[PDB]
Design a protein around this motif. Structure first.
Motif, PDB file in Angstrom:
ATOM      1  N   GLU A 148       4.442  -0.816  -2.696  1.00 49.50           N
ATOM      2  CA  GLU A 148       4.489  -1.608  -1.458  1.00 49.50           C
ATOM      3  C   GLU A 148       5.842  -1.857  -0.818  1.00 49.50           C
ATOM      4  O   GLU A 148       6.924  -1.626  -1.363  1.00 49.50           O
ATOM      5  CB  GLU A 148       3.821  -2.979  -1.630  1.00 49.50           C
ATOM      6  CG  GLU A 148       2.222  -3.004  -1.883  1.00 49.50           C
ATOM      7  CD  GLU A 148       1.801  -4.082  -2.868  1.00 49.50           C
ATOM      8  OE1 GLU A 148       0.633  -4.123  -3.443  1.00 49.50           O
ATOM      9  OE2 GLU A 148       2.849  -4.691  -3.267  1.00 49.50           O
ATOM     10  N   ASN A 195       0.803  -0.694  12.841  1.00 51.73           N
ATOM     11  CA  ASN A 195       0.327  -0.728  11.475  1.00 51.73           C
ATOM     12  C   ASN A 195       1.401  -1.314  10.560  1.00 51.73           C
ATOM     13  O   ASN A 195       1.132  -2.207   9.734  1.00 51.73           O
ATOM     14  CB  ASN A 195       0.017   0.698  11.042  1.00 51.73           C
ATOM     15  CG  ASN A 195      -1.453   0.997  11.059  1.00 51.73           C
ATOM     16  OD1 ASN A 195      -2.235   0.300  11.735  1.00 51.73           O
ATOM     17  ND2 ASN A 195      -1.853   2.050  10.356  1.00 51.73           N
ATOM     18  N   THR A 196       2.639  -0.801  10.686  1.00 56.45           N
ATOM     19  CA  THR A 196       3.691  -1.247   9.779  1.00 56.45           C
ATOM     20  C   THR A 196       3.985  -2.728   9.982  1.00 56.45           C
ATOM     21  O   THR A 196       4.164  -3.450   9.003  1.00 56.45           O
ATOM     22  CB  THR A 196       4.963  -0.395   9.930  1.00 56.45           C
ATOM     23  OG1 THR A 196       5.262  -0.244  11.303  1.00 56.45           O
ATOM     24  CG2 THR A 196       4.780   1.012   9.367  1.00 56.45           C
ATOM     25  N   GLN A 198       1.851  -4.946  10.954  1.00 59.67           N
ATOM     26  CA  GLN A 198       0.729  -5.562  10.246  1.00 59.67           C
ATOM     27  C   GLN A 198       1.099  -5.809   8.780  1.00 59.67           C
ATOM     28  O   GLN A 198       0.983  -6.930   8.267  1.00 59.67           O
ATOM     29  CB  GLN A 198      -0.485  -4.630  10.392  1.00 59.67           C
ATOM     30  CG  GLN A 198      -1.873  -4.894   9.761  1.00 59.67           C
ATOM     31  CD  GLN A 198      -2.541  -6.175  10.249  1.00 59.67           C
ATOM     32  OE1 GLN A 198      -2.090  -7.286   9.964  1.00 59.67           O
ATOM     33  NE2 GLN A 198      -3.531  -6.008  11.144  1.00 59.67           N
ATOM     34  N   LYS A 199       1.621  -4.789   8.109  1.00 64.41           N
ATOM     35  CA  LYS A 199       1.864  -4.956   6.671  1.00 64.41           C
ATOM     36  C   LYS A 199       3.159  -5.695   6.336  1.00 64.41           C
ATOM     37  O   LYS A 199       3.244  -6.392   5.302  1.00 64.41           O
ATOM     38  CB  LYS A 199       1.769  -3.594   6.029  1.00 64.41           C
ATOM     39  CG  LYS A 199       0.403  -3.202   6.472  1.00 64.41           C
ATOM     40  CD  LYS A 199      -0.580  -3.011   5.301  1.00 64.41           C
ATOM     41  CE  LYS A 199      -1.981  -2.672   5.823  1.00 64.41           C
ATOM     42  NZ  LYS A 199      -3.112  -3.026   4.827  1.00 64.41           N
ATOM     43  N   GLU A 202       1.980  -9.201   6.542  1.00 64.07           N
ATOM     44  CA  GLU A 202       1.360  -9.495   5.248  1.00 64.07           C
ATOM     45  C   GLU A 202       2.388  -9.945   4.202  1.00 64.07           C
ATOM     46  O   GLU A 202       2.272 -11.044   3.635  1.00 64.07           O
ATOM     47  CB  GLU A 202       0.579  -8.273   4.739  1.00 64.07           C
ATOM     48  CG  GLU A 202      -0.942  -8.394   4.742  1.00 64.07           C
ATOM     49  CD  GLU A 202      -1.687  -7.061   4.593  1.00 64.07           C
ATOM     50  OE1 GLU A 202      -2.433  -6.869   3.604  1.00 64.07           O
ATOM     51  OE2 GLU A 202      -1.634  -6.245   5.522  1.00 64.07           O
ATOM     52  N   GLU A 203       3.403  -9.100   3.921  1.00 64.69           N
ATOM     53  CA  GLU A 203       4.360  -9.418   2.847  1.00 64.69           C
ATOM     54  C   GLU A 203       5.179 -10.680   3.157  1.00 64.69           C
ATOM     55  O   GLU A 203       5.439 -11.529   2.274  1.00 64.69           O
ATOM     56  CB  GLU A 203       5.286  -8.237   2.641  1.00 64.69           C
ATOM     57  CG  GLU A 203       4.636  -7.008   2.075  1.00 64.69           C
ATOM     58  CD  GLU A 203       4.029  -7.252   0.706  1.00 64.69           C
ATOM     59  OE1 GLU A 203       4.779  -7.646  -0.229  1.00 64.69           O
ATOM     60  OE2 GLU A 203       2.818  -6.981   0.551  1.00 64.69           O
TER      61      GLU A 203
END
Ligand SMILES: CNCc1ccc2c(c1)N(C(=O)OCC(F)(F)F)[C@H](CNC(=N)N)[C@H]2NC(=O)C(=O)Nc1ccc(Cl)c(F)c1
Ligand SMILES: *[C@@H]1O[C@H](CO)[C@@H](O)[C@H](O)[C@H]1NC(C)=O
Ligand SMILES: *[C@@H]1O[C@H](CO)[C@@H](O)[C@H](O)[C@H]1NC(C)=O
Ligand SMILES: *[C@@H]1O[C@H](CO)[C@@H](O)[C@H](O)[C@H]1NC(C)=O
Ligand SMILES: *[C@@H]1O[C@H](CO)[C@@H](O)[C@H](O)[C@H]1NC(C)=O
Ligand SMILES: *[C@@H]1O[C@H](CO)[C@@H](O)[C@H](O)[C@H]1NC(C)=O
Ligand SMILES: *[C@@H]1O[C@H](CO)[C@@H](O)[C@H](O)[C@H]1NC(C)=O
Length: 335
Positions: A148, A195-196, A198-199, A202-203
């Motif tokens: 990740e 997309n990136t 988005q993640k 998240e982190e």
């Protein structure tokens, strides 16, 4: 703990200036490095207090001084003038090597955040090959995280400390000045960026859990840091990112707030001649752009962020040692 040396695969017959410098300053790479694993050992790293960063920073300062001479350098009161020819410029990878009696410890935990203990450890002759890419806001052409997305910071609670985001999937960015001669643009695929972020949200949410996560353009400062600035084939690009760092991650979902068209974000850029130096406090003046089409096709592999209920993150940068850190974080020199 000592002074390292560099290895490169440069040619003395390339006129590209990284090659010329490395020919003078580095030894050839050993064609098959030795590596010695040790999954029992467990040792401590601190990417934020790492002398390899200082040694490399000195090297790249020296490289840019021999290679990208400004027509005028203004530091303090004095001004220095010299020949500023256009050059061929394209970073090559550099390996940092421990001298005799001295080893480099690599941490192999794929999710190591740069700090604290690390269980699976190797010893190596040299680091992997690091391209010394000078830029703000976006880290370009580095190496991706393996598992990740990793959030690195000397201290996430202290909002004045830079946050390095290590991406696991690169995002293409294409910048060109096509055949105003200063004006250029970059294209990013809105879907890939979407997309990136988005993640990344998240982190970042794992680390600030009650909070809405907002991305917003850099507030203020010199143009080198309020835009995505970088060198492309010798020319200094300054690319506006306000359509890029512009989005909200609310309830496990990211929404892009910046403008796109045909599903690409387009960054407006300028090629500038007056540069605020990253090497020291001062200004540098270069000749007008070389002629024809100037294009760099790069991978975004990381971000530099600064944090201001809601948590807001703006692009950062300006201290090139963080660029080196983002690559040297897994290494320590010992013994
Ligand atoms: C991260 N913390 C906040 C911060 C913010 C801004 C800066 C620092 C620190 N700075 C520093 O830490 O420099 C290290 C030194 F202090 F040891 F010198 C710098 C000081 N330099 C000047 N005020 N002229 C300045 N950054 C640039 O100017 C800088 O990145 N320009 C540029 C030029 C060409 C290219 Cl392609 C490029 F991609 C970037
Ligand atoms: C990194 O990991 C250490 C524990 O190894 C922890 O103390 C520290 O807060 C972490 N930092 C970040 C930015 O996650
Ligand atoms: C990258 O990391 C993110 C968040 O940490 C994770 O959700 C995603 O599955 C990873 N993607 C790949 C291609 O490894
Ligand atoms: C980092 O954050 C704050 C600074 O505001 C302070 O408590 C201390 O220096 C650090 N805290 C931790 C948990 O490392
Ligand atoms: C970037 O573009 C926006 C809108 O075009 C503008 O408001 C902003 O001032 C620009 N930023 C810089 C640093 O030029
Ligand atoms: C996001 O982009 C729009 C236009 O693309 C702009 O109006 C807005 O100011 C940007 N957001 C921020 C926080 O600057
Ligand atoms: C990143 O790497 C590619 C391929 O080597 C190169 O063409 C591009 O110009 C690089 N970008 C920068 C900013 O160095």
């Amino acid at each position: 703990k000592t002074t390292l040396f560099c290895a490169s695969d440069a040619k003395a017959y390339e006129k590209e200036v990284h090659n010329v410098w490395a020919t003078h300053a580095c030894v050839p790479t050993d064609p098959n490095p030795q590596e010695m694993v040790l999954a029992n050992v467990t040792e401590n790293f601190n990417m934020w207090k790492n002398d390899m960063v200082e040694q490399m920073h000195e090297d790249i300062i020296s490289l840019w001084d021999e290679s990208l001479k400004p027509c005028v350098k203004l530091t303090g009161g004095s001004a220095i003038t010299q020949a500023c020819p256009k050059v061929s410029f394209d970073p090559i990878p550099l390996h940092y090597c421990a001298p005799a009696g001295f080893a480099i410890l690599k941490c192999n935990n794929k999710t190591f955040n740069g700090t604290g203990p690390c269980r699976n450890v190797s010893t190596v002759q040299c680091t992997h090959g690091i391209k010394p890419v000078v830029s703000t806001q976006l880290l370009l052409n580095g190496s991706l995280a393996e598992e990740e997305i990793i959030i690195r910071s000397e201290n996430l609670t202290n909002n004045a400390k830079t946050i390095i985001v290590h991406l696991n999937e690169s995002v293409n960015i294409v910048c060109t000045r096509p055949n105003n001669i200063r004006q250029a643009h970059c294209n990013i695929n809105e879907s890939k960026w979407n997309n990136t972020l988005q993640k990344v949200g998240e982190e970042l949410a794992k680390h600030f859990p009650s909070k809405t996560i907002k991305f917003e353009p850099s507030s203020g400062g010199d143009l080198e840091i309020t835009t995505h600035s970088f060198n492309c084939r010798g020319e200094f690009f300054y690319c506006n990112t306000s359509d890029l760092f512009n989005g909200t991650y609310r309830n496990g979902t990211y929404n892009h707030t910046g403008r796109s068209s045909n599903g690409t974000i387009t960054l407006q850029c300028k090629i500038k001649q007056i540069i605020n130096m990253w090497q020291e406090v001062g200004r540098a003046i270069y000749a007008p752009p070389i002629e024809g089409e100037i294009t760099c096709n790069s991978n975004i592999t990381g971000l530099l962020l600064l944090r201001d209920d809601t948590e807001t993150f703006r692009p950062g940068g300006g201290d090139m040692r963080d660029n080196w850190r983002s690559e040297l974080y897994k290494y320590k020199v010992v013994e």
